[PDB]
Design a protein around this ligand. Structure first.
Ligand SMILES: Nc1ncnc2c1ncn2[C@@H]1O[C@H](COP(=O)(O)OP(=O)(O)OP(=O)(O)O)[C@@H](O)[C@H]1O
Ligand SMILES: Nc1ncnc2c1ncn2[C@@H]1O[C@H](COP(=O)(O)OP(=O)(O)OP(=O)(O)O)[C@@H](O)[C@H]1O
Ligand SMILES: Nc1ncnc2c1ncn2[C@@H]1O[C@H](COP(=O)(O)OP(=O)(O)OP(=O)(O)O)[C@@H](O)[C@H]1O
Ligand SMILES: Nc1ncnc2c1ncn2[C@@H]1O[C@H](COP(=O)(O)OP(=O)(O)O)[C@@H](O)[C@H]1O
Ligand SMILES: Nc1ncnc2c1ncn2[C@@H]1O[C@H](COP(=O)(O)OP(=O)(O)O)[C@@H](O)[C@H]1O
Ligand SMILES: Nc1ncnc2c1ncn2[C@@H]1O[C@H](COP(=O)(O)OP(=O)(O)O)[C@@H](O)[C@H]1O
Ligand SMILES: [Mg+2]
Ligand SMILES: [Mg+2]
Ligand SMILES: [Mg+2]
Ligand SMILES: [Mg+2]
Ligand SMILES: [Mg+2]
Ligand SMILES: [Mg+2]
Lengths: 482, 482, 482
């Protein structure tokens, strides 16, 4: 029949690969130094032993087994334990650090026989090699490498164990492997990258090909945590979601009225407008209302410290510290520069999975956009939006405009298109003095107030008034009286 | 007379090539690892045997016949069956995986004689080689490769069988082949690419040349499905279409009136405007009307999940689930990121060919533009537009504006130029409050209402009113009363 | 257990590295000529001896010990003293400057044994090598280098001392090391760069990898001072800050009133507007008020010399020279071109740490933006903003607009988003003549006056009037009377 696959149990990878790696065949994993190729290899064998009770063999040329164990330990697991139990075997084929003699092609034959023995001895199902170039570096000829890799691949295929071979690159977008032949010999090729753009590094995983089967294509970003490799295949995200007719309060009565009876629990709300329009007040009231009803909520802060958030909240009549004491409100403060954009996604998911909030709020999306491309930014927002909706978490987001009394409160980001409810705030010029205006622009699941209303901010929170009747051109930031 | 060609029966390819490959000559197919060169080769021989009852020979150097069969099976056909029947022959010229000796140029002579024998034995008409570099890699000299390929090409020409040779590249836009001679020796050259741009891969096929004959030029995108290679030569699409005078209802009476008695069945309708203007309502009513008249329709959703579409439809009085139960309405939900733009085209065609809809609708074209270049986007839209018109399927499309009460509802995409009927929606400022406006901008086949009218959205669907008499500058988003 | 690290006591480095270098392992430090690789090496051993009383070994191939001592002295410390005391040892393995014979691989074995001896003799904990290529340059083979470095790394690992090896590059964004193998052999890789962009050099440090542990990623800028290497890991900066409810006067009564009772002591104030709106007056009054209350303040001047600042201050009734005499006011004048942007940050911190000001003011941020990218500029501003708030220093900043009576006083820089209080100044056209207007746009911790007021400048300082009642479109720069 068709080719079967073996699950790696690596988050994201198994979805990108459509079920894991081809069984009874090798896969070649490449990349430049620092991409964590050896982490993939260890995590693969590790998960096999733990999850499927499948023994495996790790072949090492470049590292003493002592360091392999010591390094793996940083991810919360003990490989030495698995070795003692007869589940994991490490085949030491490293060169002598005190002086190593030159060898010929017999080295490959000797290697394979030792691997075969180890596989049979431990009935290994999963095998990996830290560096195939350990036996190619011995010579310059690329034609020889083609043949030598062919022999290694075909021989492990004879055995039938699933194999993960590791090779290496100099360039990110250059040749897949050093000799320019290896990627043609291998039937299954995966490349890891650690691309430097601007001043930042972004890790990605790609499956170049899998002969005889299917997979997702393109570069899929990933990070490395204390649990090992975590891949974020946004294209694998589903639109299968549970809708609701449940309403929740924003903490602001006139706003709830404008939204036709509050906001939907499963909706995503985006508040936009110029800095100083009180977006942080709407956020504070949102999380406060959740706490008022004994619901858990998380605020992700980027522009203001906790000490300042507490002060500003008190000036608006909100006791943030009390909400923390009751374990209802969490404050998560971090600079955009403290983590990669993909790490912010992981942080948000981690805090949510741990605290199990009913609602979350983001202090500023425009802050996160600060250090990234438009593509990186929109993918982040989509990922968060999807997750929050799939988890049925009420979400409140903000996006700051740079138009100082210029109205025209629109986004180059275009997040409103994927968001449910849009709240627009702006400054206006009235009788020679500045004021503020609020409008509910849209709401997918309901009727909403179309009026453009004046509002002010007091020590009791927001103060919403009636519409600007007999004015024109409010949307320009400079209304005319008529 | 003139050079005759042999049809490959590969979709798109035979149109690009103007009738297939030159008969009695070789064609050299190149490309980087992962381009599926071996798929073209197998599909070529396979179709010959099935469609024209033409036996063929597959020469393998890099892969065991067992894997060739096993891999081919993923595309829904059994090559082993064809081998047993004496239709397909695989010539195994692979190196010994357990140790291979060095050989000279006699290897090429021996190869050709075995190929000649196999061709005569099975009366093969179609022959292919998986890797010509299998006998070039043996040495570094490029001058030798020129001669060695010349010998192979000329010898197979003596036989008269049509040949598809495969070679390989390192770079996408670099040399056609490794030694920089092969593309001059071969008289017919085809290059496959798997170009990485941004984070995504895009497959293309190009015919570089065919000596003595004609072909289409440039890169033509393609994808790979469970049926093998599927090429999309948009430039080969025809303007020969059947026009009609049949009208269909949009589900909205006042809109049908503005269009002069409904929309034409063979027309393409584009609705544009800012988010929240109710474009999703017009789409829902469009497919609903088709179902009301017992016509099949497909909705392609990108921005909202099925669960949410059902909720929003119910809030507007439309029972989507009932229309699904009667097998009239289909909901196809996918993220733009879940597939390549060219795959979305294939998905749309597949669903249409299967369900045979009278009408289709696209939830958002701007969503599909999100992750692609302007060139990739416009080609997609043209391809869909052409197909839908050729198939006489009523089509409804949308394009979201980013102008929040800014009117000026125009597209940087310029899809209106190829579309028949244009509907414009916008937000306006009236008496200090927001409202909506609708206008039929054009309709190629009819008279239409030129008025700019106010409208609202209720639980019964759209509510269209009369024109904004005694107002000026409506089109700016900020009308003045006079 | 997990891998332990050794603190280098190098500012910034220990935070980027999450605790310093892995213990009992080597780290490879690379970079092009002029990156100061030898400074890192010396500073590392130096700090070990001084701070932790840890003896060390410096291995030299390229420089006579006499020059190593002489060069180190420029940073305020005497290595010769440490040698005499038996704390520091320099191993001289340099070639004979009067003629050097060719040697083989025995040179590496001899080297290591001498290093081992020196380590044991002085009980060294910290070891470093100035140039590993000193024994690789002897031959061209890259395969040999792989092995030779492996031997050196593994051998020093046997000893257990923490090692800092130095290698070299030709290109900034090219291969990590000359032979393209070294970065794979080493388990811990750090790269220094001195990147030339435009006409300026910018130094950065990056940790490419640390096997078995964690670190911050990406390029982190640094400078070199008379105290050695000083790294500025902005991403490691904290949002943990102490808020306050203390108010301070700006020196301008009507402005203090508009801000609701003065400005907060812990706040950052940004004044924006066209050139000539009197931003330098607000700055002068700010520092003057601090002095009036016997508080120390520093003015950082970029656009005007001290002599001119004194003249302009006297014309506005402010005796700057007297404030200097009392050691309350400091004037720091420098051109933006006189130092790197990162050096301006270091200068600001240095002057603050020395003088212990209650308040600081920046004459022009737009001046500093003049010669730098938007990314370099915003990181600078964030760094200063963070530092000033963490140190509880009242900060006043300015940003000049290029709109001559065009109002629209907005910033492409978007510094207002991270700043607390925003003051906007603009020119307006009134009755055929130019005038000025002032508005408090926002204040995070308080109520503020929303009015747009007229103002003038006299010899007594600023003169603020009442609001522009019965005017419209003030924000455009061209108000209309109505
Ligand atoms: N606890 C951790 N948390 C986060 N990142 C970690 C942690 N522990 C290790 N890392 C990261 O894991 C990376 C994986 O190293 P790995 O050896 O697998 O990369 P590699 O591509 O194989 O490198 P090499 O070419 O040297 O073999 C390390 O470089 C380090 O950046
Ligand atoms: N069922 C399938 N659906 C979609 N794609 C598939 C399916 N089965 C296989 N593929 C794709 O078909 C591609 C064709 O592989 P093929 O060997 O022809 O490429 P190639 O250029 O010849 O590769 P190579 O250089 O290794 O020989 C595979 O890499 C895989 O991405
Ligand atoms: N007092 C000082 N103040 C500022 N910079 C200084 C001072 N003294 C030295 N420098 C800088 O320190 C740099 C460090 O030189 P160093 O040898 O460490 O660089 P390097 O990368 O190792 O150079 P090389 O490749 O020659 O060995 C010098 O090039 C010089 O620019
Ligand atoms: N006690 C108060 N009384 C009146 N207005 C206040 C008070 N405290 C703060 N403000 C208002 O709050 C605004 C800050 O709102 P905020 O939500 O932080 O704006 P942003 O959109 O940037 O997030 C200030 O500009 C000021 O107008
Ligand atoms: N029951 C309702 N009654 C009144 N208005 C509604 C109702 N349900 C939804 N709406 C309106 O429908 C709008 C959404 O229209 P939609 O077609 O989804 O906009 P879009 O152009 O983005 O696709 C909301 O902004 C709201 O004005
Ligand atoms: N004695 C004075 N009397 C009146 N106006 C003065 C006097 N001295 C200077 N000015 C005003 O001060 C302005 C300069 O203000 P300044 O703070 O230097 O502007 P900038 O925003 O560039 O920093 C001059 O354009 C002038 O209008
Ligand atoms: Mg490794
Ligand atoms: Mg804010
Ligand atoms: Mg192939
Ligand atoms: Mg929509
Ligand atoms: Mg040096
Ligand atoms: Mg000035």
């Amino acid at each position: 029949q068709a080719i079967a696959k073996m699950r790696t149990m690596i988050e994201g990878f198994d979805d990108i690969s459509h079920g894991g790696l081809p069984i009874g065949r090798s896969t070649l994993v490449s990349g430049t130094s620092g991409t964590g190729k050896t982490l993939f290899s260890i995590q693969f064998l590790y998960n096999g032993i733990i999850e499927f009770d499948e023994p495996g063999v790790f072949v090492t040329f470049e590292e003493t087994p002592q360091d392999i164990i010591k390094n793996a330990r940083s991810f919360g697991w003990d490989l030495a334990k698995l070795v003692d139990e007869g589940k994991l075997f490490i085949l030491d084929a490293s060169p002598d650090p005190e002086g190593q003699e030159v060898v010929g092609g017999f080295d490959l034959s000797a290697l394979i026989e030792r691997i075969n023995y180890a596989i049979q001895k431990y009935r290994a199902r999963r095998v990996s090699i830290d560096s195939v170039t350990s036996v190619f570096q011995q010579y310059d000829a690329s034609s020889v490498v083609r043949r030598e890799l062919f022999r290694l691949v075909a021989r492990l295929k004879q055995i039938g164990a699933t194999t993960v071979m590791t090779t290496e690159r100099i360039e990110e977008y250059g040749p897949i492997a050093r000799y320019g032949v290896e990627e043609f010999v291998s039937d299954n090729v995966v490349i890891l990258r650690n691309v430097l753009e601007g001043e930042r590094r972004r890790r990605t995983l790609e499956i170049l090909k899998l002969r005889g089967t299917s997979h997702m294509k393109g570069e899929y970003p990933f990070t490395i945590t204390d649990h090992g490799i975590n891949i974020f295949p946004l294209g694998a995200m589903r639109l299968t979601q549970r809708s609701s007719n449940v309403r929740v309060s924003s903490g602001v009565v006139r706003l709830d009225e404008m939204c036709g009876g509050g906001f939907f629990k499963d909706s995503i709300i985006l508040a936009t407008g110029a800095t100083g329009t009180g977006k942080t007040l709407l956020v504070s009231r949102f999380v406060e209302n959740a706490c008022a009803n004994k619901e858990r909520a998380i605020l992700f802060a980027y522009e203001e410290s906790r000490a300042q958030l507490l002060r500003n909240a008190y000036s608006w009549g909100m006791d943030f510290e009390e909400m923390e004491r009751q374990n209802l409100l969490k404050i998560v403060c971090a600079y955009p520069e403290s983590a990669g954009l993909e790490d912010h996604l992981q942080i948000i998911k981690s805090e949510i999975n741990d605290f199990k909030p009913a609602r979350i709020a983001i202090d500023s999306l425009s802050a996160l956009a600060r250090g990234v491309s438009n593509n990186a930014f929109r993918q982040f927002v989509i990922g968060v939006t999807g997750y929050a909706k799939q988890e049925e978490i009420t979400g409140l987001f903000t996006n700051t405009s740079d138009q100082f009394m210029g109205a025209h409160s629109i986004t180059d980001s275009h997040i409103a298109e994927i968001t449910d409810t849009i709240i627009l705030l702006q400054y206006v010029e009235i009788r020679g003095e500045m004021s503020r205006a609020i409008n509910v622009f849209k709401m997918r699941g309901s009727w909403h107030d179309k009026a453009i209303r004046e509002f002010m901010i007091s020590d009791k929170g927001p103060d919403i008034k009636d519409s600007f009747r007999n004015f024109e051109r409010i949307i320009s930031g400079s209304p005319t009286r008529i």
